[PDB]
Scaffold this active site. Sequence first.
Site, PDB file in Angstrom:
ATOM      1  N   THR A 155     -73.547  88.056  33.609  1.00 41.94           N
ATOM      2  CA  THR A 155     -75.001  88.432  33.444  1.00 41.94           C
ATOM      3  C   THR A 155     -75.741  89.223  34.475  1.00 41.94           C
ATOM      4  O   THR A 155     -76.318  90.425  34.109  1.00 41.94           O
ATOM      5  CB  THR A 155     -75.605  87.061  32.896  1.00 41.94           C
ATOM      6  OG1 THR A 155     -75.098  86.379  32.034  1.00 41.94           O
ATOM      7  CG2 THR A 155     -76.994  87.504  32.471  1.00 41.94           C
ATOM      8  N   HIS A 305     -72.432  91.736  28.426  1.00 41.38           N
ATOM      9  CA  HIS A 305     -70.846  91.646  28.253  1.00 41.38           C
ATOM     10  C   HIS A 305     -70.619  91.274  27.138  1.00 41.38           C
ATOM     11  O   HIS A 305     -71.601  90.652  26.415  1.00 41.38           O
ATOM     12  CB  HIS A 305     -70.548  91.009  29.453  1.00 41.38           C
ATOM     13  CG  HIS A 305     -71.236  89.782  29.631  1.00 41.38           C
ATOM     14  ND1 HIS A 305     -71.024  88.564  28.605  1.00 41.38           N
ATOM     15  CD2 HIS A 305     -72.186  89.284  30.513  1.00 41.38           C
ATOM     16  CE1 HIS A 305     -71.810  87.668  28.890  1.00 41.38           C
ATOM     17  NE2 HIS A 305     -72.459  87.823  30.162  1.00 41.38           N
TER      18      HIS A 305
HETATM   19  C1  LIG Z   1     -82.900  94.091  30.200  1.00 40.77           C
HETATM   20  C2  LIG Z   1     -82.918  93.129  31.559  1.00 40.77           C
HETATM   21  C3  LIG Z   1     -83.294  91.965  31.433  1.00 40.77           C
HETATM   22  C4  LIG Z   1     -83.294  91.448  32.551  1.00 40.77           C
HETATM   23  O1  LIG Z   1     -83.431  89.896  32.778  1.00 40.77           O
HETATM   24  C5  LIG Z   1     -83.501  89.312  31.575  1.00 40.77           C
HETATM   25  C6  LIG Z   1     -83.680  87.778  31.786  1.00 40.77           C
HETATM   26  N1  LIG Z   1     -84.686  87.159  31.548  1.00 40.77           N
HETATM   27  N2  LIG Z   1     -84.446  85.839  31.566  1.00 40.77           N
HETATM   28  C7  LIG Z   1     -83.091  85.384  32.159  1.00 40.77           C
HETATM   29  O2  LIG Z   1     -82.536  84.529  32.337  1.00 40.77           O
HETATM   30  N3  LIG Z   1     -82.599  86.714  32.164  1.00 40.77           N
HETATM   31  C8  LIG Z   1     -81.077  87.235  32.546  1.00 40.77           C
HETATM   32  C9  LIG Z   1     -83.181  91.722  33.987  1.00 40.77           C
HETATM   33  C10 LIG Z   1     -83.145  91.130  35.278  1.00 40.77           C
HETATM   34  C11 LIG Z   1     -84.650  91.138  36.007  1.00 40.77           C
HETATM   35  C12 LIG Z   1     -84.604  90.394  37.126  1.00 40.77           C
HETATM   36  C13 LIG Z   1     -86.083  90.745  37.815  1.00 40.77           C
HETATM   37  O3  LIG Z   1     -87.059  90.648  36.872  1.00 40.77           O
HETATM   38  N4  LIG Z   1     -86.333  90.972  39.079  1.00 40.77           N
HETATM   39  C14 LIG Z   1     -85.190  91.053  40.046  1.00 40.77           C
HETATM   40  C15 LIG Z   1     -85.342  90.880  41.501  1.00 40.77           C
HETATM   41  N5  LIG Z   1     -86.288  89.967  41.808  1.00 40.77           N
HETATM   42  C16 LIG Z   1     -86.471  89.453  42.995  1.00 40.77           C
HETATM   43  C17 LIG Z   1     -87.514  90.237  41.060  1.00 40.77           C
HETATM   44  O4  LIG Z   1     -88.693  89.974  41.438  1.00 40.77           O
HETATM   45  C18 LIG Z   1     -87.594  90.855  39.648  1.00 40.77           C
HETATM   46  C19 LIG Z   1     -83.627  89.531  37.536  1.00 40.77           C
HETATM   47  C20 LIG Z   1     -82.356  89.526  36.790  1.00 40.77           C
HETATM   48  C21 LIG Z   1     -82.396  90.274  35.528  1.00 40.77           C
HETATM   49  F1  LIG Z   1     -81.520  89.984  34.699  1.00 40.77           F
HETATM   50  C22 LIG Z   1     -82.847  93.244  34.062  1.00 40.77           C
HETATM   51  C23 LIG Z   1     -82.957  93.846  32.898  1.00 40.77           C
HETATM   52 CL1  LIG Z   1     -82.605  95.542  32.883  1.00 40.77          CL
HETATM   53 CA   LIG Z   2     -74.663  86.932  30.395  1.00 39.75          CA
HETATM   54 ZN   LIG Z   3     -72.214  83.526  29.667  1.00 40.88          ZN
END
Ligand SMILES: Cc1cc(OCc2n[nH]c(=O)n2C)c(-c2cc(C(=O)N3CCN(C)C(=O)C3)ccc2F)cc1Cl
Ligand SMILES: [Ca+2]
Ligand SMILES: [Zn+2]
Length: 798
Positions: A155, A305
């Site tokens: 993920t 995925h």
């Molecule tokens: C569509 C999409 C969704 C996303 O997350 C959805 C989500 N919500 N809850 C949950 O478990 N997941 C997986 C993310 C995502 C964003 C950040 C973030 O926001 N970051 C990273 C750096 N750090 C340090 C930050 O400050 C900001 C971190 C991990 C990610 F997977 C990216 C995309 Cl493109």
């Molecule tokens: Ca996943």
């Molecule tokens: Zn999984």
Amino acid sequence: SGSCKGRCFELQEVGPPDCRCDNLCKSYSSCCHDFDELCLKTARGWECTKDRCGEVRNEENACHCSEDCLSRGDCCTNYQVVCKGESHWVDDDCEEIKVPECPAGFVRPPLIIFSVDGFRASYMKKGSKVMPNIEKLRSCGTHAPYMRPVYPTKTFPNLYTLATGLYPESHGIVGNSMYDPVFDASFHLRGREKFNHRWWGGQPLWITATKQGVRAGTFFWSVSIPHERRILTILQWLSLPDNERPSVYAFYSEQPDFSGHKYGPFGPEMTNPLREIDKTVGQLMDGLKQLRLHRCVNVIFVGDHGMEDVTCDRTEFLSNYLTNVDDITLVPGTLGRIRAKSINNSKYDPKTIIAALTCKKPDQHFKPYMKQHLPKRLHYANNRRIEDIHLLVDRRWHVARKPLDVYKKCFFQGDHGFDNKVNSMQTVFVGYGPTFKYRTKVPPFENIELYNVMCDLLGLKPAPNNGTHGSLNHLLRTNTFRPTMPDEVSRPNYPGIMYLQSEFDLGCTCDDNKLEELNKRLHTKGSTKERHLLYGRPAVLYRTSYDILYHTDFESGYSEIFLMPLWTSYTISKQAEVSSIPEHLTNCVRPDVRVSPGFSQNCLAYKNDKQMSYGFLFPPYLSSSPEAKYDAFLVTNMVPMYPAFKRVWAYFQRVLVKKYASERNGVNVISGPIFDYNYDGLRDTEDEIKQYVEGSSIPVPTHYYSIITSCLDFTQPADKCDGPLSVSSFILPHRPDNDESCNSSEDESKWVEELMKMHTARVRDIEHLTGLDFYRKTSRSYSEILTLKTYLHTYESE
Ligand SMILES: Cc1cc(OCc2n[nH]c(=O)n2C)c(-c2cc(C(=O)N3CCN(C)C(=O)C3)ccc2F)cc1Cl
Ligand SMILES: [Ca+2]
Ligand SMILES: [Zn+2]
Ligand SMILES: *[C@@H]1O[C@H](CO)[C@@H](O[C@@H]2O[C@H](CO)[C@@H](O[C@@H]3O[C@H](CO[C@H]4O[C@H](CO)[C@@H](O)[C@H](O[C@H]5O[C@H](CO)[C@@H](O)[C@H](O)[C@@H]5O[C@H]5O[C@H](CO)[C@@H](O)[C@H](O)[C@@H]5O)[C@@H]4O)[C@@H](O)[C@H](O[C@H]4O[C@H](CO)[C@@H](O)[C@H](O)[C@@H]4O[C@H]4O[C@H](CO)[C@@H](O)[C@H](O)[C@@H]4O)[C@@H]3O)[C@H](O)[C@H]2NC(C)=O)[C@H](O)[C@H]1NC(C)=O
Ligand SMILES: [Ca+2]
Ligand SMILES: [Cl-]
Ligand SMILES: [K+]
Ligand code: NA
């Protein structure tokens, strides 16, 4: 102690110890006391009913059915359906969206990324009956049959690749679990460390938007915020004044992945999670329709995925192979990463670990690699967070250190993380909105390409990334990005005959009419070049010195620096014949009188080097005539090859090329060496070369590539193709043994093609590795050519 009043899901996150009402406050234990009460209202659920219509606004309610709700932007998403006799979005015919139809004051169509965890590509067909809102997006908008994730198919690596356009080795999220030896810190799904900014490299879409004046909504949602509240919050944000309203949003669902792990990708329990996701898509589209935004917003429906059947009885245990199992740390599961348990252990030896893990059981369901020997298409090496030893696990299996690890923790029936070409790991892409095309199917593509397109959809300049900008123009009605071909940096020399045979002292030997004599000179002058160089010569994008060499059967760009071709190009028609190497020429190498002795290889070095032999880039087996066959023995067509690799190469050249020419109606082939000693996926400079043929300046390639091009309409021969092209390529590791192939003691027909398929490649991978730019002169649009260069032939079934 502070208050969330009027600050619910604030976009700007306040500095503690002021309490936070932003999304991530739960994930940090830092929410204001009244967060739940003010920001997570649930009273009366999520739908309007006939009796709630025109109610007096009651601020305790989860959403509203009061007359003033539309202007306030906080109606229940079914408000107009239940109260105003409107239809659900899904019940409306689709109508082409030719232009954005947005309320005044919108400066650009907003983008909503609707991401769904573990949504396997085949769910679009297999679950179509239970997902009508998603099926409407898919059939009305632009969709691919699947979208290729990055490796590992987990993920965070995939979502952060979507966010950045970067391979995991470049963005730094190389797994769901990681150890960074520079920081001496560990990254885990559970826990606090993962929030530290030093894990997350590149520049994600929300930062790109912000730096360029475009406001972004939250991407990361706390697991305890219900999906309906995430939707209502997006809809609320979209009702903000022009100067505060974000232009990009993400929704995330942890389904269907969460259920997929418990029940398997197609367990009967999976129907309900798919219905629930579809209902959420319906809530969003009804909510957009109420706001008159359903023909204004670009929506991307995308997964991270897929999901494969995996049970705990399909586990391989390292304790079955290693006597020293307690001296290692294993990152386990659908991939394996091994390092020493203790860095003070001087006895720890990775070569002997690899040996003990190599082809030890007849049906062994994992294969060990040093990371630099992984298929280059995975781009999974250039990061200190990737351990030197890697286990590629067969689909449907797990690897673990000891049986205790698996039964001290068969609960699960589904998992993912495998090689990103595996069919069950493929995921989905649908784009719907004014900027996407209408009722259009596009070929499968890789998720590293999406960041560029999302930048295009928002009018942003993308940060440097691994996408090939323009390769996805065919998804878009407008806002296409029109790149120019990179400029050639080095122009070739075109040497004529300049050296006498006796000037060469190379330890090389070869047992060696005016109609036919003008004939050979014209071939050397490039008279057949239009047959063998079908798409123009490759452009050299770095500073070097090289020569173009013409021959009857092939043309080459010969490097005076590396003493061999950068590229060799030749066309083999459907009718071409395979002949054998005549006996008088078996160890023949001929000096090339166009190229100085001092810029030539020599046979003595090969003779001295007991480990290294040599092969040819244009195969003598495929010469057009006995006289043209002498050209294939030029010293300028020779490359260093380990004897073990020569088994691979000979079978490709003698058997496979002709087979492809029969199947595809002729093929054009471009072959050459690759030097990637620091495994960064990029062309090495001459000072990075770690190995030479003993006692010489002849550099040893780490890989050999071939690009095999024909007409997509195979009723037209490759050399007379009118329209779009078809390509397959490979980057084969140049290895001194065939330990990677467990069946290599058998005849090459039982294992070489399987090896080649494992090392399939995009033309664009070869371009990074060589500093060359291919397909410079075709009759095709440049974006179509960029799509071709990003194509990967996967050799998976339907
Ligand atoms: C569509 C999409 C969704 C996303 O997350 C959805 C989500 N919500 N809850 C949950 O478990 N997941 C997986 C993310 C995502 C964003 C950040 C973030 O926001 N970051 C990273 C750096 N750090 C340090 C930050 O400050 C900001 C971190 C991990 C990610 F997977 C990216 C995309 Cl493109
Ligand atoms: Ca996943
Ligand atoms: Zn999984
Ligand atoms: C996929 O796309 C990406 C993005 O385009 C491509 O990656 C780029 O590759 C470039 C070429 O290798 C690389 O350029 C180098 O940048 C150095 C400055 O880097 C910092 O600043 C940038 C810009 O903001 C930032 O992006 C970097 O972020 C990396 O590092 C941090 C912290 O480690 C990570 O959090 C982040 O995830 C990212 O890590 C990745 O990249 C680094 C390498 O930069 C890897 O080591 C990691 O494993 C991981 O993959 C940085 O914060 C700059 O210093 C370099 O310049 C050296 O080399 C040039 C050659 O021209 C030389 O002239 C310079 O003087 C300098 O040499 C000196 O230092 C040498 C090395 O220490 C030393 O040997 C010499 O003696 C010299 O003194 C270089 O220009 C660029 O950083 C990355 N960008 C990213 C985001 O990765 C990638 O190649 C593409 N992949 C494929 C297959 O195409
Ligand atoms: Ca390199
Ligand atoms: Cl992992
Ligand atoms: K030798
Ligand atoms: Na073998």
